[PDB]
Write a protein that binds this ligand. Structure first.
Ligand code: NAD
Ligand code: CL
Ligand code: CL
Lengths: 247, 259, 252, 247
């Protein structure tokens, strides 16, 4: 009901948060182009959900695959309303001595260059429509340390800067750019229930997906430039002091 | 719908943003008690809105009125799910030479002390329930200067500090706390002249970064609905700006070089 | 001697951070008016330091006392170059059920209302001179929760907002306004406290004292920061940038 | 003389802000290794200044040169106290349609990958010394839009993220990590005087160097994790609104 008639591309959408966002976008009447490099998962999901969900293989590090992905969406569906640049790779907390220059440049290619390209070509076709919404997947590590590795946090910080620069530029054309910075997805929930600030609730892929839905829906028509954290308050506190003197 | 069976108290709900949230919360099936000091506006709206909408006069600077507001709401409905601490007064851009120690202490009492009290007694009844959501109305001036007066911006900065410390404290009980920072909504700030309205909105469209839509009270209401909905079940500690990116840009540099 | 010929007023300057900044400003050649309400401590410091240090009793809650403080500094010294609004009262981490409306309004008067007044009358004499620097004492609690109480946290946040609008307004007259946000709970803290320092401080091997915070104010007030305005400069050893819970549960 | 006996490496130190910091570091009694790829400027500068200023050519995108830059510096002077990771390239305000994947990757290598490497090998040799300070040159564009290009802005956000996670990790070894984010230093002064928020004063390289001196001095012994802006308040205001309502 909320996304009726809208066309959304979700890179990295064959699995996890992107797949949860694809299904929820499908439930709200959006035509969704699943983009990923896991072709069996992507094709299986796009067929199971039905006629308005297609799949397109797209390694986001190849600008030509990306340009073609958006161009196939405009030809097939008339245009692109939503670009959910979610394709990335994740590393947990590490040390600066664990950073390998080739691993670093690879992560930067998927995480930062991939977001750059997915934005450029979403912007390429959105600008003439004088409509459009771009949502990147950052990470809660954009507002606190100790929950991701050095290469990962820096790539996600760069997405936030890209998101704000796109919000100002594409704002003149009625186009919004936003981030969602989730906290903990990929025994594991027991560890999450111990570290979360907001106790009781566990963070799931749909939880992040319904937040992307908000940012992409007309309900957030005036939300732009925003890196919306979904962390249950994890990033606003350093409990070390309180633990040493109250526990 | 999204708020069905939930009980929300909305301070400042007799006009503007608070009233738009009352109507929207009402449309989504919540029991809503309008809390305000404009008694004609507040009472008439709650009666016209219907059965699930009550009114309670409450000057938020008076802790006894605030304690009573929540206590009678708990008696009427069993508990409080949502507290939208929205009551406030606004100052436009001014000079530090215009601040009068009384006008400042008055501004602080309504905006910041009211925010503390509305949260204190909302937590009083929410903590035992192990459930609840508290939402404060801050201001876009909490992330940029040049769009509000000194006392007003300082009160809203203090609301943000309060929101984040409540997010940590009440988080142990499954209770969420968040802010909304709107950017110039046509409201009880602006008088009722259609002229005074079209001019406020027209300049807001000029100064706005995101062109092609105007920001209204209902737009802010739908974000409060999001923040209070279970759809934001893991969103806490956040000051969500609704400004179309106004606070992320200083266009002076680019303007000077397009000569 | 970085403050040669400069005249600085330091509210709350009879003790702690304010006293360390008065001494350091004195060492750098500034004429300093100590402003406080601890008259025993306040007068003793201004006399012991020497000829360029006077004292002026001033409750920052009283606009007439503060208006006199600035007017006396102008009378004795020609003008005001630096206003260090340091006067405040402190709360550690607490619960919102511990907040008393009268105690809240008292803290707000000293911490926030006082900062406004010291700025209004510092601006009063700085603007016609088309120069001046106003520095507030905020707190590291302005960037993280859990290291100050609700009332204290909100008052220092309000100082940060006040500082930024003054930075915009007073910038047009060549006047800079900045905050310093120390890690107050850890400043100048026995083997109990030494154990707590190692556990809670992020930058290990070092300790924060009042003298350390004074030199950051010296930096912020000197000409070394001629283009530094609008800044909330933390002196916290990086405490506010990390939530170590996650790695802690998974390293055990 | 605040830096007596301290050893500083300054990448990008043959010109601009890096050269200004080299001279000031020289005046405060530091041994400085000028690191740059402008060999004529860099070698001439290191010779003019004297005994305590040497030169080392170093492309920061080449980890082997960077690993060598630190190792030759430790060999010559005993250790590295200050690492001023200043080497970078600049992009002005532009459009997302102007970003070319190869220019994007080139800028990213110099600005961000250089920052990772320069910190990694400074961290390599600082950690055993249980002392040390790393200072990155970020940018005012990390706190406001409209004053730099998309690729540059994202690279500088990434430096800030790197700095924050390094501040947490290397803090355990008594090592500090901070940024400096200057505004307009790289006809011209009239534009700066009318775009600046703090009127009456103009920002120069000498100004940024003394802020770097502060951050590198022991006067800042408990400052870590900070991105210190030197912008005269430019990033804290959007004056568009007040302009329209004043005349
Ligand atoms: N309208 C804008 O442009 C804008 C922009 C940013 C932030 N805000 C914030 O939105 C908040 C809500 O105000 P609004 O914009 O909806 O205008 P409004 O005047 O229409 O509504 C504010 C309500 O608070 C009530 N109020 C004043 N003092 C009170 C007290 N002691 N106790 C209880 N209620 C009291 C008023 O009666 C009013 O019904 C304000 O706190 C304001 O700071 C507004
Ligand atoms: Cl009324
Ligand atoms: Cl900002």
């Amino acid at each position: 009901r909320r996304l009726e008639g809208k066309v959304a591309i979700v890179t990295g959408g064959a699995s996890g948060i992107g797949a949860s966002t694809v299904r929820l976008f499908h439930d709200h009447g959006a035509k969704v182009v699943i983009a990923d490099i896991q072709d069996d998962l992507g094709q299986t999901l796009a067929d199971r959900l039905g006629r308005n969900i297609s799949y397109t293989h797209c390694d986001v590090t190849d600008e030509d695959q990306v340009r073609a992905l958006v161009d196939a969406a405009v030809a097939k569906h008339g245009g692109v309303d939503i670009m959910f640049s979610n394709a990335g790779i994740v590393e947990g907390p590490n040390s600066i001595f664990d950073v390998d220059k080739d691993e670093l440049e690879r992560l930067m290619g998927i995480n930062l260059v991939g977001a750059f390209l997915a934005a450029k070509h979403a912007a390429r076709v959105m600008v003439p429509a004088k409509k459009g919404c771009i949502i990147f997947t950052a990470s809660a590590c954009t507002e606190i340390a100790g929950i991701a590795g050095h290469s990962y946090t820096a790539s996600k910080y760069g997405i936030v800067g890209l998101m704000k620069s796109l919000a100002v530029e594409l704002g003149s054309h009625g186009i919004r750019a936003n981030c969602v910075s989730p906290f903990g997805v990929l025994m594991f929930e027991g560890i999450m229930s111990k570290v979360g600030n907001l106790k009781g609730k566990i963070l799931t892929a749909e939880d992040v997906a319904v937040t992307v839905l908000y940012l992409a829906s007309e309900e957030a028509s005036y939300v732009s430039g925003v890196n919306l954290l979904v962390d249950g308050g994890y990033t606003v506190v350093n409990p070390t002091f309180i633990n040493v003197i109250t526990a």
